[PDB]
Amino acid sequence: SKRYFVTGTDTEVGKTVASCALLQAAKAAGYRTAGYKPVASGSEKTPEGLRNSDALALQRNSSLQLDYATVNPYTFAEPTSPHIISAQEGRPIESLVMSAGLRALEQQADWVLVEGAGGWFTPLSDTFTFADWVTQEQLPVILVVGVKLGCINHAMLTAQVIQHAGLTLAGWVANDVTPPGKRHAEYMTTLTRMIPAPLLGEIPWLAENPENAATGKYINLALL
Amino acid sequence: SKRYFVTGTDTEVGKTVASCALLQAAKAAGYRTAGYKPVASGSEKTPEGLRNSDALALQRNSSLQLDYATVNPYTFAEPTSPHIISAQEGRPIESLVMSAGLRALEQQADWVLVEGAGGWFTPLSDTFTFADWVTQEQLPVILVVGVKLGCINHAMLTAQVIQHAGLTLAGWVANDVTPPGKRHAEYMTTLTRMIPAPLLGEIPWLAENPENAATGKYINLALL
Numbered sequence: 123s124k125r126y127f128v129t130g131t132d133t134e135v136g137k138t139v140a141s142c143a144l145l146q147a148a149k150a151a152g153y154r155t156a157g158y159k160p161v162a163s164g165s166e167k168t169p170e171g172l173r174n175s176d177a178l179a180l181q182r183n184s185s186l187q188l189d190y191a192t193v194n195p196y197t198f199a200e201p202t203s204p205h206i207i208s209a210q211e212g213r214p215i216e217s218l219v220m221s222a223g224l225r226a227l228e229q230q231a232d233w234v235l236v237e238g239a240g241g242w243f244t245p246l247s248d249t250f251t252f253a254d255w256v257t258q259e260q261l262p263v264i265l266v267v268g269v270k271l272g273c274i275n276h277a278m279l280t281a282q283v284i285q286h287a288g289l290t291l292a293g294w295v296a297n298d299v300t301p302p303g304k305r306h307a308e309y310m311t312t313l314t315r316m317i318p319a320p321l322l323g324e325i326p327w328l329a330e331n332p333e334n335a336a337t338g339k340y341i342n343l344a345l346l
Numbered sequence: 347s348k349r350y351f352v353t354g355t356d357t358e359v360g361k362t363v364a365s366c367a368l369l370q371a372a373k374a375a376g377y378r379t380a381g382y383k384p385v386a387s388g389s390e391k392t393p394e395g396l397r398n399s400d401a402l403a404l405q406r407n408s409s410l411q412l413d414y415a416t417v418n419p420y421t422f423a424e425p426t427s428p429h430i431i432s433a434q435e436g437r438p439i440e441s442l443v444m445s446a447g448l449r450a451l452e453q454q455a456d457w458v459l460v461e462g463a464g465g466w467f468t469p470l471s472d473t474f475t476f477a478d479w480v481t482q483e484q485l486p487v488i489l490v491v492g493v494k495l496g497c498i499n500h501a502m503l504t505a506q507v508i509q510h511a512g513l514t515l516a517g518w519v520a521n522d523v524t525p526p527g528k529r530h531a532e533y534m535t536t537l538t539r540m541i542p543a544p545l546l547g548e549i550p551w552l553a554e555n556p557e558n559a560a561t562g563k564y565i566n567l568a569l570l
Contacts, residue, residue, distance in 0.1 A: 132356070132496060132500075133495050133496040202529050202532075203498060203529075203532075203533075203536070205536070206529060206532045206536075240496070240498075240499055241496060241499030241500070241503070242499055242502075242503060243498065243499045243502040243503060244498070244499055245498065245536065245540075248539070271357050272356060272357040272464070272465060274427060274464075274467065274468070274469065275464055275465030275466055275467045275468055276356075276465070276500070276503075278466075278467040279465070279466060279467060279500075279503040279504060279507055280503060282507055282510075283503055283506055283507065286506075286510065305426050305427075305430060308426075308427075308430045309427075312427070312429070312430075312469065315472070316469075
């Protein structure tokens with residue numbers, strides 16, 4: 123089965139928006155899809171426990187019917203770095219648990235998308251980062267680049283680090299986080315030249331909630 | 347003579363604020379200082395040509411009397427990536443010119459601070475980045491980290507890339523770009539543990555124009 127790890131180059135680049143577009147495109151291709159966000163911070167209280175909106179988006183965009191805990195085993199109330207709330211709450215983030223949830227999904231889906239929390243080097247504990255887990259899982263990576271101020275530097279830094287860890291950079295998705303501006307074409311050209319992986323598509327600026335929009339049309343899965 | 351390259355982990359981290367604090371601290375230590383910003387975009391028109399405010403700050407905080415062109419040989423009007431305006435204007439950014447200006451300063455100053463434009467991987471041309479120039483100059487690097495959302499990932503990415511290029515990470519400076527928030531102590535602790543270089547100091551949040559503030563007291567130059 124196909125499996126990918128999605129990470130962003132900076133905060134607020136629309137990582138979940140791109141993830142939902144990817145899931146919709148995979149489903150259109152005929153795959154049995156599953157979204158997985160092992161760790162999520164910043165969540166609402168419900169009668170059944172804490173719920174994270176990004177995990178809800180992945181749950182909803184998966185073709186299979188999945189239970190929330192399957193999509194997101196680790197949910198924290200405060201939107202801060204996972205290693206900080208984890209320590210405060212006395213709830214360790216276990217590599218074995220994150221890996222188990224991945225296997226669980228692989229038993230039903232042909233195409234699994236794993237969404238990280240924060241960026242590449244987000245700490246899960248004092249001695250373990252998200253990059254450590256992706257590296258041990260040998261997951262190919264899809265980079266979500268927000269077309270904004272500073273994206274060239276952030277995308278190159280992330281790409282270099284990933285390749286250096288011996289992982290495959292499967293592709294990148296350009297997310298237009300702001301309305302059309304000047305230099306947009308120039309930024310896209312520079313990013314295309316510099317990121318050593320295929321551009322899968324560009325999701326235009328949408329003002330509502332791109333997570334709920336039919337965005338799969340913007341992804342060219344044949345390039346993965 | 348001492349020479350350092352200052353880079354930031356993200357946009358708007360206060361790189362020039364930290365640079366001015368560094369210059370003030372070096373002067374207090376008795377050094378003959380010089381600030382150097384080889385490339386600068388986003389500049390005001392004056393009767394004598396384009397002037398960049400960050401270069402003006404470095405000029406003013408240098409102990410030696412320096413001419414503007416000495417501090418900033420390359421000035422562009424539009425605040426975009428240097429390789430883009432450079433190409434548009436038909437004015438190539440020459441490695442030899444940037445290096446020459448560095449030698450020029452070294453003939454008068456004992457302590458030279460070089461401030462980059464953008465982040466680490468800022469392109470100067472289609473085949474040359476700022477990182478290429480710093481690497482050939484073998485300049486030790488000082489990282490300016492804005493204590494904000496996403497700083498841990500950006501600081502680790504930058505640090506790893508710099509070490510990988512075989513350069514020395516001389517130290518880092520924490521700049522408080524926003525008013526005091528929760529998790530500030532936790533962020534500082536994480537950054538201190540993860541960045542493999544000494545914390546030189548932390549510049550508090552100041553609402554006016556930190557570039558004009560006496561901030562040298564916040565830097566401990568004995569750690570460089």
